[PDB]
From a paper:
The protein C is a small viral protein encoded in an overlapping frame of the P gene in the subfamily Orthoparamyxovirinae. This protein, expressed by alternative translation initiation, is a virulence factor that regulates viral transcription, replication, and production of defective interfering RNA, interferes with the host-cell innate immunity systems and supports the assembly of viral particles and budding. A previous sequence analysis revealed an architecture common to all Orthoparamyxoviridae C proteins, with a predicted N-terminal disordered moiety and a C-terminal helical moiety. We solved the crystal structure of the C-terminal part of TupV C protein at a resolution of 2.4 Å and found that it is structurally similar to Sendai virus C protein, suggesting that despite undetectable sequence conservation, these proteins are homologous.
Author numbering:
A (entry chain C), B (entry chain C): 60 to 152
C (entry chain B), E (entry chain B): 59 to 151
D (entry chain A), F (entry chain A): 59 to 150
The structure:
């Protein structure tokens, strides 16, 4: 009933093509980068409030089921980056 | 050890602020819009290949555990939109 | 006269940018889904506020015995997932 | 827990502004009318460009035949009026 | 002379846009995580290709008895999740 | 299942281009050197603007005191050379 040609025509008119594997990786990188920046901000909010961010704090946050699986996947990279940022801010010039 | 002031300063230097509730909704809308467009494309790929997209096809795709939970959440809105698009493409002028 | 044709040709260049018909059908469908999702999210948070904890089993019971409309049932899981994210986000911060 | 209730109460204040259901039905209908009007205006100007002069009689003939969809027939006169305004506005 | 100062002031306006130090630390950390994640994803797909099906229990066993490096263990779950998405995406399409 | 293996084999061909580990260590080190060089160049020009003329003797004094980090000391001469080129290039 011309249904196949209609579909073929709609597919050309659709804004974005079907996502490549390369585009799935890029999209997943952006999502990890977004979630990592929120975790970094959460950990620095704790540091600002007077809860010092240490390996032991991260271990206790992990033991306590506080964090989503996506957060638990990124909590160590967030920890590493927070430490780098705290050390960078410490040095003069 | 000036750790709180360091954290307070880093938080001002961070590109994006902590995400509002409004921004969580906007971000969730963009993710639903992205996943809906991919589902619409998958269903139209089926229509192009000669698998007619009907309420019964969607029921069978749902019975068979083929789709992720996020896909199952959007398969009916994708179905509705595919039907609208197929009907819009059918009419002359 | 060909004056009329040139006037029309000039007006066609000056017309505001127009989304294609299919692209506008998608955008319009996204806005409608986003609006209906935000109402459901509000309804579920109203339940939580009043002391009815929003859980997978509450959603199952509301769906059994037809307490939700078919339009609600279409979006109830995305609404549920977003409410859970929001309750977790509020618990931090 | 009382914590869950207060969290929900706080989230309800933080939720983006929501148009009431009736107000949103109007707004949505305005957007759709504006979109369909601008398509019809473009279609009528495409005809003018191709050498079909856009007149009251052309609109009557398009209506008397089922050449237009119901949605188009609803907006064809406002599209006609606007096309005439635009043709008059052009090259004053 | 104040010639030297004005020359410097002019050069400072002409210098390419510079990301702030903290923003560059984030960007650099994202690139490193993205690179290491893509290597792990490749390693896991190589296993799948060779006939070792990539499952939650395989990841658990590789993590127990220290078969993965600490740097691998840091990203193994995000790699796992992405491999699962990619295998599901390839099954459609 | 043989299906899983072929899917993986196909995904491996579709994966974005990956620099080898050694090549990526070089590229990453180049980006970091380029970034830290441009910061030092900016710092030296900020000094020139403020009235501290940038000379070989100033760089020697900055080095002889532990005023610079190890990363800065590694790049201070290339930053100096580039600042001198830029000051000479400006107002030829």
């Amino acid at each position: 009933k011309r249904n196949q040609e209609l579909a073929e025509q709609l597919l050309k008119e659709l804004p974005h093509e079907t996502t490549s594997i390369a585009n799935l990786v890029q999209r997943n990188n952006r999502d990890l980068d977004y979630n990592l920046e929120q975790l970094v901000r959460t950990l620095l909010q704790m540091e600002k409030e007077g809860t010092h961010v240490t390996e032991s704090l991260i271990n206790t946050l992990m033991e306590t089921d506080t964090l989503t699986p996506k957060e638990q996947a990124l909590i160590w990279p967030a920890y590493n980056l927070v430490r780098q940022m705290m050390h960078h801010a410490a040095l003069h010039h």
